[PDB]
Amino acid sequence: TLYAPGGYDIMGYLIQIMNRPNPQVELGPVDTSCALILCDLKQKDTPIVYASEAFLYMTGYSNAEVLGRNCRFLQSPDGMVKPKSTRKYVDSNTINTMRKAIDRNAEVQVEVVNFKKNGQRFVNFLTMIPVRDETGEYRYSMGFQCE
Ligand SMILES: Cc1cc2nc3c(=O)[nH]c(=O)nc-3n(C[C@H](O)[C@H](O)[C@H](O)COP(=O)(O)OP(=O)(O)OC[C@H]3O[C@@H](n4cnc5c(N)ncnc54)[C@H](O)[C@@H]3O)c2cc1C
């Protein structure tokens, strides 16, 4: 996984999201003080390319343990979840809903059981919205996590 050398336009993307003409889920106002991440949809397995301070702190994982990985790792108390595996602590329907929404560039909002680095179980009120890069086409996905 590689990252944009100059960094990501997180604030620009936040504004883009709040300005979206056809919102499908209720986000309301959000900013960089929250736990959020940006994944690259044009790279293998939609890797995380940006994680806010709040996300790292809320989950207990460091930047080096988050960047370049699919966020599904939060689905196991040991931070290890293989793609297509049948999770034993997370509802399959919820996981499937997330997968199809991403594949369709459709907004989605769910409550999913996740685990912190120390293994603590928590419910993640998660919202994901597709983001267009400078080309005007969808390239990234911004996720908003809330314990
Ligand atoms: C920006 C962003 C932020 C994210 N943040 C989080 C986060 O904070 N926490 C989190 O947990 N995830 C998060 N995700 C989601 C995660 O990265 C994956 O997208 C999610 O787990 C679903 O995709 P998958 O690849 O894991 O699917 P898969 O590994 O393919 O798993 C799908 C599961 O659903 C079941 N299933 C599939 N199809 C069907 C069907 N037709 N009928 C019945 N069952 C079916 C299967 O049994 C399977 O185990 C985020 C994603 C993005 C893009």
Strands in 108-115's sheet, in edge-to-edge order, are: 48-51, 35-40, 138-145, 121-132, 108-115
What domains are there in the chain, each with its CATH number? Answer: 1-147 (3.30.450.20)
Distance between CA atoms of residues 16 and 4, nearest Å: 19
Distance between CA atoms of 95 and 101, rounded to whole angstroms? 10
Would you list the DSSP string of the chain? Answer: ----TT---HHHHHHHHHT-SS--S---S--TTSEEEEEETTSTT--EEEE-HHHHHHH---HHHHTTS-GGGGGSTTS---TT---SSS-HHHHHHHHHHHHTT--EEEEEEEE-TT--EEEEEEEEEEEE-TTSSEEEEEEEE--
Please, what is the Cα angle at 89 between 87 and 94, to 5 degrees? Answer: 70
One-letter amino acid of 34:
C
> Binding site annotation covers 99?
yes
Pocket test for ligand 1, best of 71, 81, 93, 145 (most atoms within 8 A of CB): 71
User: C-alpha dihedral over 78, 58, 29, 20, to 10 degrees?
Assistant: -30
Name the token pair of 17: 């999201």
Asked if 60 and 117 touch (Cβ cutoff 8 Å), the reply is yes
Cα of 125 from ligand 1 centre, angstroms: 14
Cited resolution, angstroms: 1.7
- The experimental method behind these coordinates is X-ray
Query: Of all protein residues, whose CA lies closest to atom 47 belonging to ligand 1?
Result: 86
105 in a known ligand binding site: no
